[PDB]
Structure formats: C-alpha cells, structure tokens
C-alpha cells in the first residue's frame, strides 16, 4: 500500500532516537569481514584430530550455522512491521542487524569449508527440541508480524528471537565454545570469528530489550506476557542443552586429550543464568 | 511457515554464485559512513546563497531524500521473496543493498540538517508524476511480492525499483547535480556523499540486471514484459523531468550567478539515454 509522505522530506531523522544511536555504533564497530579470517591453522588443527575428537566439535557448529542462517532470514518480518509503523530509526538500525547476521552465517560456512566438512550434512545434530525452536517457533513468531503487528505479536517475536535464541542460546554457546577450545588452543580463526560475532550480538540484544521494554511501558499486562513466553520456550532450551550434554559425555576423548574438564554442570548453569538475566532486563515499569 | 533445512548445515554457501561475489565486493567497497562527511562548507555555501538561489537546489534534494527513504523501505519484500525461494546468496547480498540505502537516506538527511532546512517541508516539490512513481507504483510493485512471487511479479518489481527509479531517475539525478554544483564549486560535502552513493548504486543495478536476466533466460516472453513495464513508466519519468526543468527555468539566478549554462536539453537527453541504456542490458536471450 502507498506512502503517506517521507520523514526526511517533512523533517529529519530523529538524531536522538536510541535506535539511531545504536545504528551509529553498528557502523563504527561493524567493520569486520569474515573473508579476512585466516583459517589455515583451523584446517591443520581439525585434521590433527582423531576421528572421534573431530565429531566432538561438530554438534555445536551444526547448531550455530543453522542458527545464524535462521536469524538472517527471520529478522526480515520485524524490519517490515516496524517500517510499516513509521519507525524509521529502527529500520536503519535493523539494516545493520541483518547484515551482521549475514556475516555470521558466512563465517561459520567458511570455517566448515576450510576444515573440510563442507560436504558433510550436519543436520543430524539437530534434535527435536532444536527443531522446535529454530525450524518452527522462530519462523512462526516472526512471520506472524506480516499479518499481525499487535504489541503482543511484537513482544513474542522479540522474545523468541532476541531473548531466547540470541540472548540465551547463542550467548551460552559462545561462552561454551570459548571455554573449551580457547583452553585447548584450538581453532584460532573460528574463535576470532566468534569474538567479532559476540560483539555484534551485544547490539542485537539491546534492540530486543528496547523493543520489549517500549511495549511493556504502555501496559504492565505485557510484562506477564513476556515472562510467560520466556517460560514456554525454556523446556526446548534445556532439552537441547541435555541432548548436547549427553552427546559430549559419550565423547570424552577431546576432553581427555586436550585434558579440559568440560564442567557440563557449569555450562548448564550458565544457560540457566543467561535466561534469568534476560528476564531481569525487562522491568514491569520503566 | 517452517524451515525445511539449512544450506550451511547440509552444504555451504555457493561461493561462486554471482550474488555472493557481489556481496564480497559490497563489503570491501561499502565502508563509507555519512557521519564522517564534513558539511561545514555546505552550511556556509547555502547561507551565502540568495533566497531564490537557495530554492534552486531544493527540488532535487526533495526528490532524493524521499527517493532514498522509499527504496530503503521498499527493498524488504524483495529480500523476503528471494529468501523464501531459498536464494541465500541473493539474500546475503541484499543485506548490503539495504544498509547502503539506509546510509543514503542518512546522508541527505544530514545535509538538510546541516544547511538549516531540516525544519522545512520539502514535500511541496513532489508533483503528481513523482508521487505516481515513488508514493504509489514503487511500493505497489514491491509489496506484491509478499503474495505473488511469480517470474512476472519479480521482473516488474526489479524493473520499477532497479531499472527505472535507481537506473534511470537516480542515475540521471546524480549526473545533473554534479554537472551543476561541481562546476559552481558548491556543496563539497554533499557531492562527496553523492560520489559514494553513486558507487554503491553500481552494485544495486547489477542485482536488478542479474535478477531480470535470470528470469528472461527461462522464457523469451518475459523480455517483452520487461520492455513493456519500462515503457509504461516512462511518461511519469519524463513528466517529473519536465516539472523539474520547468521549475529550474523559472529560477535562473544561480545559473546566472554561478554562470553555469544548465543545458536542460542535455540533462533531458541523459534521462532518455539512461532509459534506453537500461533496456540494452537485458537481452531476449542470454
Ligand atoms: Fe543477532
Ligand atoms: Fe525431550
Ligand atoms: Fe540503490
Ligand atoms: Fe503531467
Ligand atoms: Mn548472529
Ligand atoms: Mn540509494
């Protein structure tokens, strides 16, 4: 449907808008290029691994590649909904969000190619709970926005996308990967990639917090909605975590070899901790 | 609706895809930031102008600010349609397309703020023909893709967006602005902005050419469709050009003052020339 007018012809960008300020930061700090990462050492490292050390790494890489791909694709409806509501600064910021995700998908896919598992189908490490979140709930909640951009639909989208997928699962997965492979001294290029990624994702969660909070601010009721959508997903979050935990426990060599005490009961608590932490960034009134 | 799987878990990005290669170039050459442009001289220049020299510049700025805003918003459905068709490399490239446009809107809006016309409503320089293209035909053709992503709907979208708006009108408008204000020595910051912009837009047109050509390649019939949608818009293109021409002719001082022979009959022929040129980049068979 038509345009009514244009904000930058009638007025200007709102230079003080919190999302314009996040946009300015995204440009300043968003310069990294996955094509510049030297993966030659990751290649040698992965080859040097035994065939069962090799698979120890792959479940997490399978959850991330798919994860980054899904969120690259599934942010588009948010951008549309907010655009149609006239929230131009939000939209400007979301262009950097989307391009960041594109680079995240790119980065993992380059790592897979370079270490020589590009031809390998990693779908086999997505259990039913992973599919529920990434193959199903994430795209259902975002796509809904094309026909329903009610406060309730926008809170639920930002909750599933930003608070659970990015704010709980990805955050914990970055922590985990660094806890394990940084201590072993493995996969320097990938870890460099993860670090850049982790920095981008700091902005992304700030958009979700801003979005959920500005809706909650209109009406307290929406707070209980937020808490509820969080608790609804939790079973699928921990059920993916158990599945991974249980995979990694039946492969103990890399932990033995590189001699790393993978405290699964410490990772598990980080997930639990991230989740509660996200709840605390939304207040019933603010 | 659900995801079936993920290309970067089953396989990798198609590193040889023409849109992945355009994505890589966009990252390398897409580093400019409008926030870094020094507009202090543009401010002094605009103040130094007489009040009727001042308005000589504004119609074109009004067509561009709105123009950049519209295309920032109206590329989203293309990204969605291609995403839903599984064209991941296209989508990656389109993240850079969208962010480029965000910066284009940003750049003009900064120029308006800096020269002190930010509070001025420039909508008054959008005649009926401009509205037909930008307020109406552009968003109708893009949004259609949400419900109809037939070859025919995708060709028409790329034609209106990339071949007419960007490939004909914007291209000509950049040429014009540089023909006039570069020769006068005015508005150095804006021209710097326009130059960066013109470089980004080289990639954008290559996506539209790629998109139209890959559809035409399936079936010659679509070529006549392409030519026809081009010819349908032309009246609105030249009717905006006459309106501008006719504005600039009833303001002759800046042309007198800065002593520039604004050959309107040379600009007019550039528009005609860009248009035919775009037709020639699509072949009935290739
Ligand atoms: Fe993210
Ligand atoms: Fe289960
Ligand atoms: Fe463009
Ligand atoms: Fe007319
Ligand atoms: Mn990401
Ligand atoms: Mn542009």
Report the alpha-carbon distance of residue B195 to residue B33 in Å, rounded.
Answer: 12
**Which domain covers residue B220, as residue numbers?**
1-286
Resolution in A: 2.0
Nearest-10 crossing angle of helices B51-74, B221-249:
160
Which residue positions of B form the known binding site for Mn(2+)? 68, 101, 104, 129, 166, 201, 204
Inter-CA distances, A224 with A103, A148, A156, Å: 35, 20, 12
Q: Looking at chain A from residue 50 to 79, which residues have their Cβ under 8 Å from any Cβ of chain B?
A: 62, 65-66, 68-70, 72-73, 76-77, 79
- Domain total of chain B: 1
Contact B254, B59 (CB under 8 A): no
For chain A, say whether B218 makes contact (Cβ under 8 Å): no
Contact A31, B27 (CB under 8 A): no
Report the alpha-carbon distance of residue A265 to residue B178 in Å, rounded.
Answer: 65
Burial of A249: CB neighbours in 10 Å, binned 0-12, 13-18, 19+? exposed
Other Cβ atoms within 10 Å of B209 Cβ, number: 17
H-run or E-run covering A89: helix A88-115
- Both tokens assigned to B284: 């009935």
* Rg of chain B (C-alpha set): 20
Residue with tokens 């507009």: B39
Shortest Cα–Cα distance, B96 to chain A (Å) = 6
- Both tokens assigned to A155: 């809170």
Inter-CA distances, A206 with A19, A156, A209, B275, Å: 9, 16, 5, 44
H-run or E-run covering A131: helix A128-131
CATH number for the domain spanning B270: value is: 1.10.620.20
For chain A, say whether B39 makes contact (Cβ under 8 Å): no
Residue with tokens 């779908």: A123
Tell me, rounded to whole angstroms, the distance of Cα A37 from its chain centroid: 20
A260: left (phi over 0), alpha (psi -120 to 50) or beta: beta
Q: Secondary structure of B52-110 in the HEC alphabet?
A: HHHHHHHHHHHHHHHHHHHHHHHCHHHHHHHHHCCCHHHHHHHHHHHHHHHHHHHHHHH
Report the alpha-carbon distance of residue A237 to residue B30 in Å, rounded.
Answer: 37
- Both tokens assigned to A23: 């946009």
* Rg of chain A (C-alpha set): 20
For chain A, say whether B91 makes contact (Cβ under 8 Å): yes
Report the alpha-carbon distance of residue A48 to residue A54 in Å, rounded.
Answer: 9
Residue with tokens 């509820």: A228
Report the alpha-carbon distance of residue B257 to residue B237 in Å, rounded.
Answer: 29
Question: Is residue A3 annotated as involved in ligand binding?
Answer: no
Contact B230, B183 (CB under 8 A): no
Contact A279, A205 (CB under 8 A): no
For chain B, say whether A137 makes contact (Cβ under 8 Å): no
- Both tokens assigned to A186: 């493995």
Contact B216, B94 (CB under 8 A): no
Query: DSSP characters for chain B?
Result: ------HHHHS---TT-HHHHHHHHHHHH----GGG---HHHHHHHHHS-HHHHHHHHHHHHHHHHHHHHHHHHTHHHHHHHHHTT-HHHHHHHHHHHHHHHHHHHHHHHHHHHHT-TTS-GGGG--HHHHIIIIIIHHHHHHGGGT---HHHHHHHHIIIIIIIIIIIIHHHHHHHHHHHHHHT--HHHHHHHHHHHHHHHHHHHHHHHHHHHHHHH-THHHHHHHHHHHHHHHHHHHHHHHHHHHHHS--HHHHHTT----HHHHHHHHHHHHHHHHTTS-S--
A220 φ, ψ (degrees, to nearest 5): -45, -35
Contact B126, B236 (CB under 8 A): no
Shortest Cα–Cα distance, B79 to chain A (Å) = 8
Tell me, rounded to whole angstroms, the distance of Cα B221 from its chain centroid: 27
A119 φ, ψ (degrees, to nearest 5): -85, -5
Contact A23, A96 (CB under 8 A): yes
Distance A208 CA to ligand 3 centre (A): 28
């Amino acid at each position: 449907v038509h345009h009514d007018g244009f904000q930058t012809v009638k007025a200007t960008i709102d230079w003080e808008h919190p999302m314009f300020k996040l946009y300015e930061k995204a440009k300043r700090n968003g310069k990294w290029n996955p094509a510049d990462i030297d993966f030659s050492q990751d290649q040698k490292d992965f080859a040097s691994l035994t065939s069962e050390e090799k698979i120890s790494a792959l479940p997490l890489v399978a959850g991330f590649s798919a994860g980054e791909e899904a969120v690259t694709l599934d942010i588009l409806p948010m951008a549309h909904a907010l655009a149609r509501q006239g929230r131009l600064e939000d939209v400007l910021f979301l262009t950097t969000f989307m391009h960041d995700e594109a680079k995240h998908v790119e980065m993992f896919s380059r790592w897979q190619q370079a270490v020589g598992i590009g031809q390998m189908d990693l779908s086999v490490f997505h259990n039913d709970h992973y599919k529920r979140i990434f193959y199903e709930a994430l795209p259902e909640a975002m796509n809904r926005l094309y026909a329903d951009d009610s406060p309730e639909a926008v809170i639920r989208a930002a909750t599933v996308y930003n608070m659970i997928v990015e704010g709980t699962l990805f955050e914990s997965g970055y922590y985990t990967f660094r806890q394990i492979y940084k201590k072993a001294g493995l996969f320097p290029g990938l870890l460099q990639g993860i670090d850049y990624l982790n920095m981008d994702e700091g902005r992304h969660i700030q958009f979700g917090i801003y979005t959920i909070q500005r809706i909650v601010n209109e009406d307290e009721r929406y707070y209980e909605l937020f808490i509820r959508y969080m608790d609804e997903l939790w079973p699928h979050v921990i059920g993916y975590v158990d599945y991974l935990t249980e995979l990694g426990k039946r492969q103990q060599q890399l932990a033995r070899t590189y001699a790393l005490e993978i405290d699964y009961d410490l990772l598990r608590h980080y997930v639990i901790k991230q989740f509660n932490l996200r709840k605390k960034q939304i207040s019933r009134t603010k």
